Symmetry: D2
Subunit: 405 residues, 4 copies
Amino acid sequence: TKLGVHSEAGKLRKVMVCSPGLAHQRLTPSNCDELLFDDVIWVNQAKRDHFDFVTKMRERGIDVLEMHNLLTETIQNPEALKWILDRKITADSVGLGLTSELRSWLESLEPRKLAEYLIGGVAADDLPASEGANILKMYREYLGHSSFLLPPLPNTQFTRDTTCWIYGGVTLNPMYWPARRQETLLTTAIYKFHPEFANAEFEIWYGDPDKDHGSSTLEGGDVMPIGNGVVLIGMGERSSRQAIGQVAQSLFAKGAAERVIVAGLPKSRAAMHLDTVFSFCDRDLVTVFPEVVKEIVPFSLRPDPSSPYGMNIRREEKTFLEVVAESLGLKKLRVVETGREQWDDGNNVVCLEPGVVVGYDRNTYTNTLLRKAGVEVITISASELGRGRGGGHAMTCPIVRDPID
Amino acid sequence: TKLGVHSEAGKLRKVMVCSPGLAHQRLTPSNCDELLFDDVIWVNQAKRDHFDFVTKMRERGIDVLEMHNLLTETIQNPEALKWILDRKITADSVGLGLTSELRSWLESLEPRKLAEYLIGGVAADDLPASEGANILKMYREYLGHSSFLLPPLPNTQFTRDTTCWIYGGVTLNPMYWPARRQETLLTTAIYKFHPEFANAEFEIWYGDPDKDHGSSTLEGGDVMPIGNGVVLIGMGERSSRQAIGQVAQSLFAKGAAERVIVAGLPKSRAAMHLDTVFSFCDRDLVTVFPEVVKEIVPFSLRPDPSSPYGMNIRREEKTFLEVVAESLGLKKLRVVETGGREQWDDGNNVVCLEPGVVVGYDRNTYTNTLLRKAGVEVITISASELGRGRGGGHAMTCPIVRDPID
Amino acid sequence: TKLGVHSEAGKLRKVMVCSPGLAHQRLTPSNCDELLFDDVIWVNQAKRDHFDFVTKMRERGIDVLEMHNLLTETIQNPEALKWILDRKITADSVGLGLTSELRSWLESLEPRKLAEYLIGGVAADDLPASEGANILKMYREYLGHSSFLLPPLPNTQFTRDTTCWIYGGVTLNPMYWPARRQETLLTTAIYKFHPEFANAEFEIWYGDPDKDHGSSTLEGGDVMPIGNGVVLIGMGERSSRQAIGQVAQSLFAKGAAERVIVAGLPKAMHLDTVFSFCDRDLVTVFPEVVKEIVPFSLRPDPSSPYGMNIRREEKTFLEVVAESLGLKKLRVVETGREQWDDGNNVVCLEPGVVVGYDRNTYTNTLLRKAGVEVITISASELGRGRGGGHAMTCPIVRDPID
Amino acid sequence: TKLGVHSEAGKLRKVMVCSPGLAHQRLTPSNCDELLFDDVIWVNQAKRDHFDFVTKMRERGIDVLEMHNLLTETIQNPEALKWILDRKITADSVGLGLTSELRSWLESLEPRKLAEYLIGGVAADDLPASEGANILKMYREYLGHSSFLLPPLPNTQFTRDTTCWIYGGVTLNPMYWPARRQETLLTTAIYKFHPEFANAEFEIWYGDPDKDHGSSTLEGGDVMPIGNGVVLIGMGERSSRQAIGQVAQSLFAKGAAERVIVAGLPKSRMHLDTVFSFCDRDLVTVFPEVVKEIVPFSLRPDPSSPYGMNIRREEKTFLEVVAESLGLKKLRVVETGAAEREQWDDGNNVVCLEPGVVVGYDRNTYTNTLLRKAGVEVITISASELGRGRGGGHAMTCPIVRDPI
Ligand SMILES: NC(=[NH2+])NCCC[C@H](N)C(=O)O
Ligand SMILES: NC(=[NH2+])NCCC[C@H](N)C(=O)O
Ligand SMILES: NC(=[NH2+])NCCC[C@H](N)C(=O)O
Ligand SMILES: NC(=[NH2+])NCCC[C@H](N)C(=O)O
């Protein structure tokens, strides 16, 4: 089947996940926050928890693609490896006194360790001896500077955000935190050169790891192509209006979407994606974080030949849940709120098929409700995986998912 | 003479400054820390204090250029205004639905006002009424998002960092904090089009608003062309090795410097430039914040004709105050310690007008009484407002022409 | 002419203030924050400004009492000194290894100096060489531990908070931040022994520095005896409900008040920071916060086992206040034009006369239009402590109106 | 019955623990920060984990006492109950309007449950409908005010800290953070009225929940009666010199210790047992960066002193000082946190069960691996949930009876 994602709840054919790796081995107490993690994690156990997760879907007939294995196969291709380093290793990222050797040693590496380093990041102490690399070791100890030639990209674990598919099209997103900004290059190389993508039919709606985006930032966790030619997009936090306006315009220009419902998320330095406060568990069933979903102001954005920028905004008077409801042809949306006994946040489950969802073991209360609501809930352990502030939805990137209606 | 800064102590002939303005009237308790200010300031009083500063430099023969002025004149040439708006207003900065509204509006303003808007930023309601401004206005009144089309840039007040002159040439600095990165486009426009620059002779050693630069960040406050063919550059905080390398590489190619003393500064996300902890007051005098300077690891970048990159970095094994001293044929630097004997003192960051004549803040009476006992004449300005901005005289000046010392 | 405050706009006849001093001299980029200052200030300048604030007041016939002076006089009476030192210098505060040398050292000083220290705190370096003092220094030099035997109390500058007068009585307030709790004792001593107070006739409605009040915290800037046997008290930020309820109870039981309008505050800031009187029916306000104030009326009631009734007022805070004073409506000047400005916290010297800061030109001019003579002082240093005229004044005698 | 802890390494015969509970059910993402937790924890899971820890210690002969159980039994004695309530329910803690109600309500509950409320906190909501309680509900409803009459004390989980045995006696700690301060009254009530203590013999070196203490703070995690009349106490973070000085004196006056070794802790934002732990007779785990910065000071008795003590600064690294005081040439050391490591790891805070047997967290594989090579048996437990409270086995245990070596 032609690549493409046509809803949030239909049968999921092909997903991309990224297992914890070397990046997380590089987490430290004094750097985890800047690396967007609540704390260091026990990496080995996290690989086990992630694999079990891979397994629970790769036993449901879903073809789960792992990012390391894809990069790996992708760089085995000489051309493809030339394309990434040419843009990754440079005078402005690595240093003119190191670019040569860093690239040399990396090009020396077996494909699979190379790919491990493109995601995990490279430390001065990982290159062969040179005076260029020894002073770094020195800057870092002596002064407390970073020694990373290439940085650790632990959030690649969150494939939901680096790129997202919108009905047979994908966006290569300009990440908000600089800490996750280098991710797009890699995933972009994959779609560019990997056999699973290269001779495949599909559009690149918006994005370009080569271009500098400034204030336009978009992250997949804020994107949901729900099925009517309608697309939901959260705004004001990770995704900016500059960004949504250009994606919307593209999608309208190719007829990919008929309407985009912008979800205005009240501001907060506490950055949260749409999928963190609102998820789909089935045709007419969603879990939500009430406190945050009742504050959201929806604006419908539709194409407009009678407008210079070819579109028309309009603010929706009812509530987000009300708006999404009609936009799907519903009398209403069944609802499970995530905030008896302890606090719980069971938002961010991912649908595998309508009626089947994968979430975290620890949200027993939100999960029993989901079940009393006819949803089969498969749980995976959030002990380590969840320390990165994301769940099932955040750990998946749908590439092929069937429509619903 | 030619445009060019050849020391830190030599006779100041031409300085650029930027007066507090609209950008500052935009300060609020909730935005001031991201805008790099300690608190809101009384702008009319700031303006007075800044002009007192200008005046005290003007009555000494120094030619004091003020950024708003320069921007305004520059704006008069349609070409300069085209080049700037062409770059400041994109769907990636302002948004597909407000680009035409904004630029057209800005073009309707008289030069000096539009100048004030480019520096001070543009909010939604600053614009004539329209759907665009309104949808923009709601995002803020319902969701609390920023209405700023153009962002205010209050740190333009610190002329020192945005760009800097190293001997006979300038650098267009790619700022550390997002909140200052848009400053560079504005000054570059002046050096390009304004008459005092457009024809003058100087070299542009490093920089370009039109490029990404990525991990390369450089800031004037961390650059000192102390003279004798050397340049001191603080590293680790606002300025990165990725940038310095290129700077040192360019200065050597064109024989503008013979060596660069890279000052390795202890880390602290709490920012902090080299001129805030170390400062020349006189040819052999310097103020210093002990607690950070005696943690500086010195290094020397010298051009090496036989290296793929063309230069060697030897770590010095003497203290920074020793590596500096010796690089000016100096036995030893004389020092005045800052950061407190009666109360705390933050006397670094003064600025030399001529060997033996500095300008600093009135409040640092200790440091000042010592600079004076060490034979310096210290002129003072008020810190009450200009200082809630985290900067001193040095921070508020950008020498364009300062004489050789020797 | 008895002691008491019977309004916020009435003719001020006697006030306590405290100039900046040794405490502020101890400010640093590293402690200022925890000492409740936005930064290190220029002290001598600060002292000149405060002195201007004082002279500007005295020129109006107001009896302005300086805390350092009150204290200095107070400790000239041996019993007073002892009373204070016994409480202040213990093994739990100073350390058993230094209570003797610190005390005998302090008692050797000229009163004035002694007081400067009680208010400014005392460092290990200030002491006469001793081994006790040396390890103290050692803890500082080698590990960054505080070398203060007695901590600096720069917030004494804000006399408004540590104690407050309500219709013929005062409260010794259990302070909220550990950084200001040591203030209460100093002032209690003054009220206890100083001749201006010792023989004066007045009630102590609430408080005791010798008692640990646990969750009961109460700060001056949240209290306002507006008149009509009514009393305003902001709650939820620096003043807790546990403190407020026992304060009301005492007032009602001694007949010193008819009603207590609790001002429920959202989410630190005292009441006089987002609301304050400028004239008989005129106030300054910070819209964003005052519009959210939930008011609760607290009155006497034989029905209740704790003998008090609470009703949540349906109308806004501005109205309830209005009505409580017989006014149909209060005239309001908002503080959120050329720039942002916070001009709340002025202090009235009488009806129509107010002292505030030079910087708040926009609010000062609107106040002038409302017919108020606005005397201004410099905020450049004094305001870095986060407090205006109202915060730096503790009315002792102030007439009512009507 | 001779209670007393005369070592860190010797045979653990009696410890007190405190299982996670109601207190932890009240953790929220907006309140965990100030409750000293890294995040909310899966309480039911955490309970099974604690039980595993508890069972593992019992299966080895150690007498393990559950703080809730002790409280419960203590509560049944009317006197004890009243000794607690009189002190815990006052106009200053609960407010005049609700003191009577709260007390009657509590006094009407089953002991076990009343103990759970005493440790877990009470919410206005938990009281039977009443005008008083509804007012408190509205301060929370309309102003966002805390509605706790009594506060949850989830850190009771860390019995290490609220009290601590030092040879033949114990200290009733005046806690550092106000969030843990109300823990002391409860354990003191236990030690004062519960049959397992009221009759046993032991001294009370220092402490009193009735007193205020001011700047005298002191916590169990900083205290170590290592043996030889020697006691180690970390200074500067949770425990202050004004407290340490009073304790040393009390032990010196009663002849329970010869010397107190104050371990100068570098300035703040952690307890001593968090960067230094005994695993055997001559073996300790160490967190290099902080341990190499500790400045030891020897505090010995002294008649010549008006206050009876004299303290001297030592130039020997902390590790030597402890070695020397234990009569050892030097301590075997295992560094946590430059070997051949795979990731960050923090295996400090293990607790010994007896010489050569320790209980640590399963996640710290590298450290437990070096500990095993040093000849220590390392029983592990899950930190998935327990550890989000910032503490290990040493922190979750309060040795009551531990023989010396
Ligand atoms: N779609 C999501 N909810 N993603 C969660 C991503 C979490 C990751 N640590 C980040 O900061 O990006
Ligand atoms: N060279 C200097 N000292 N510059 C100081 C600039 C201060 C300004 N508020 C900033 O954070 O950028
Ligand atoms: N009534 C007042 N506004 N008092 C202000 C006191 C300011 C002082 N820094 C404090 O934080 O307590
Ligand atoms: N002895 C210890 N290591 N205790 C650790 C205590 C952890 C607890 N969350 C607190 O901050 O109090």
